[PDB]
């Protein structure tokens, strides 16, 4: 075994948009979760169904790291049984979720003067996302009874919008880098453990 | 085949009033987020106001302009308005409106100069 690539997902230069969140599969390595939980550089480190303290004592078959960027007021939606445009149309956590949600402020990294327009989000959808689903289509949403014919107009709108993170925004509109850890137990040798 | 040009700038005095208009073309400004930025000669480009694509509270303003500015969304004319009231000679600059629909779309800008004194 060797070290787990935690610095690759937590310290990446550019994170993914919430509508197109990335996933990093971590296997065949020893992981030290205590240094992540006790670093104080994370304003939110909330685990569901597992203790963050004694998280090192457990072994799992696979660990998934989902990373993206939302705004300040939307971090509370990265929780099980939560609702909102992020949880409904962008990233849904299951009701029986087992893992940890990690979110820290990244205004000094993800906001430009005049606005950083790289981070997007979904605004409309015909039906809510199932847990861990991921929508990518840029199809013009039909909000009315008239079809759209692939053209934006009345009741037909482009379903994606940008956050436009600029530094002097209020905290509720500043960028927040979010990492969601999922632990998997399978009929297979537990490949990731603690020190 | 998509653009937006702003108008309504010009000269005004003291606690005057001005109506900017970000006339959008080629797309419906209904569930879009418009930003208002301003640029005074030499200094940094400052964010002024913003109206969001969704939200219970869809209006956003900076601390320097809060209470005096109001950003509206005319759907019949397919344009976005910015109501600047009780002006001050400290907030005169070039005003821009930016939107994102697939890519960043810029306005050319408009000149707003408010004055003070006697004449």
Numbering used by the authors:
A (entry chain A): 333 to 527
B (entry chain B): 1 to 119
The authors write:
The virus exploits its trimeric spike (S) glycoprotein to adsorb to the host cell-surface receptor, angiotensin-converting enzyme 2 (ACE2), resulting in proteolytic processing and conformational changes required for membrane fusion and cell entry.
Sb16 angulates over the RBD by 83°. In addition, several non-CDR residues (Y37, E44, and W47 for Sb16), derived from framework 2 (27), provide additional contacts to the RBD. Sb16 and Sb45 directly impinge on the ACE2 binding site, offering a structural rationale for their viral neutralization capacity. Other cryo-EM studies indicate modest effects of the N501Y substitution on binding to different antibodies. In contrast to the effects of N501Y, E484K revealed major incompatibilities because of charge repulsion in the interaction with Sb16 via K32 and Sb45 via R33.
